[PDB]
Amino acid sequence: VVVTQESALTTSPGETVTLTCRSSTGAVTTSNYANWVQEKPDHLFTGLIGGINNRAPGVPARFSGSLIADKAALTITGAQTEDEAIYFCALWYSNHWVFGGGTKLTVLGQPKAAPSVTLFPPSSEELQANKATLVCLISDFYPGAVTVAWKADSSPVKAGVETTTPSKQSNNKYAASSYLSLTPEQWKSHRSYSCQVTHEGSTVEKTVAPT
Amino acid sequence: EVQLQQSGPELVKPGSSVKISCKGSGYTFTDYNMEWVKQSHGKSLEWIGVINPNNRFTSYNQNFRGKATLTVDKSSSTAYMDLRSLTSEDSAVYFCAGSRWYQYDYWGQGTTLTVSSASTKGPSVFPLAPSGTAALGCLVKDYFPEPVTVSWNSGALTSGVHTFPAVLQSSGLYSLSSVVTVPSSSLGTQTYICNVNHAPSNTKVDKKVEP
């Protein structure tokens, strides 16, 4: 049995957004007792809807449940910035719950901003430890999505890269960090390494050289 | 307030057992069944089973028979789930939840379980030296297990500080970075020290970061 949800939706404050929940067995019925639960950062789950379109205790009136066609639905009217979260549905099948895959709901509560990027070369201390890490600091962007690409001189490098999932700054914009691990040999043997950050509003490339 | 307070994070070797507790307060414990849920890979949710505090009746997801055992102690308002014969497949965040009338009303805070035979490894710390405002930071390399915490100037510095989530690397070790945006005019006359704490290895490092 498989429960299917949209993977991502985007809305804005004050808008109406509708999430849906499909059952692979056929039509969702009120006897599937569709539940909706909300996941926020730091593993914070909150019940929203269950039973038959019943709101959980303390849930704002703007959340409501219904059936739409053969699917269960969660409607958020007048969406708020706080409604950004992952929404999971769960359906009951006589003797067990089955969860959908979740919908990532973005609420654009901020003017879009392309990041400020600072690229740090490996420190001489780390090179003396026979290691090399380039650090690409990606700050003050919105929404919380960027693409990062690394180059050795003018050629792409994919191996040895790890990027953080965007994290919220205290000003509600996002930051992220990307790391390229190299040997000291590799670092000294190219003219330059670059970190290229792509955001909807701008692409910026920063470059560092061992000299 | 309604609280479902779960026991703390667990790091255990393959083949061991763990018992997770979930204590309810601030509601009528016997008005709710206690559901248990596993979240793997930080994404997908599976229902493990449910127990009724009034009569110890239980229902299980057949996939968890012989893995999970649900018990309850009405008098202390605590539900428990024992997980046995642990493998890396059991590494996950586990949740208890209070349900009534086919509705998940209340959620615990989650219990992180890591099944691993890896040994503790303390971090190496390197400066991210600065070269309007300037960015500087500290790079915390190749440690295990989480967490590392970072302050600046023993907590006296917080404006412009962002400590990133760790990355999990191919090696199985973690790395993270902490950065501060400061006035350029303060470079060379203000001391900036990152204080890196890795409690699992009993390690603390202070690194003064200089231009």
Numbering used by the authors:
A (entry chain B): 22 to 232
B (entry chain A): 25 to 155, 162 to 241
From the reporting publication:
In previous studies, murine monoclonal antibody (mAb) 2C7 was raised against gonococcal lipooligosaccharide (LOS). mAb 2C7 elicits complement-dependent bactericidal activity against gonococci, and its glycan epitope is expressed by almost every clinical isolate. Furthermore, we identified a peptide, cyclic peptide 2 (CP2) that mimicked the 2C7 LOS epitope, elicited bactericidal antibodies in mice, and actively protected in a mouse vaginal colonization model. 2C7 recognizes an LOS epitope that comprises lactose from heptose (Hep) II; lactose from HepI or GlcNAc may also contribute to the 2C7 epitope. In this study, we performed structural analyses of mAb 2C7 and its complex with the CP2 peptide by X-ray crystallography, NMR spectroscopy, and molecular dynamics (MD) simulations.
First, we determined the crystal structure of Fab 2C7 alone by molecular replacement (MR). The space group was P1 and there were two copies of the Fab in the asymmetric unit (heavy chains A/C and light chains B/D). We refined the structure at 1.70 Å resolution to a working R factor (R-work) of 0.177 and a free R factor (R-free) of 0.216 with good geometry. The electron density maps were clear and continuous for most of the Fab, including the complementarity-determining region (CDR) loops. There was no electron density (2mFo-DFc) for several loops in the constant region of the heavy chain, including residues 155–160 in both copies A and C, and 216–220 in chain C. A cartoon representation of the Fab structure is shown in Figure 4A. One loop comprising residues 155 to 161 in the heavy chains (A, C) was also disordered in the structure of Fab 2C7 alone. Another loop containing residues 216 to 220 was disordered in one of the heavy chains (C) in the structure of the complex but ordered in that of the Fab alone. Based on a superposition of the Fab with the Fab-peptide complex, the conformation of the Fab did not change substantially upon binding of CP2.
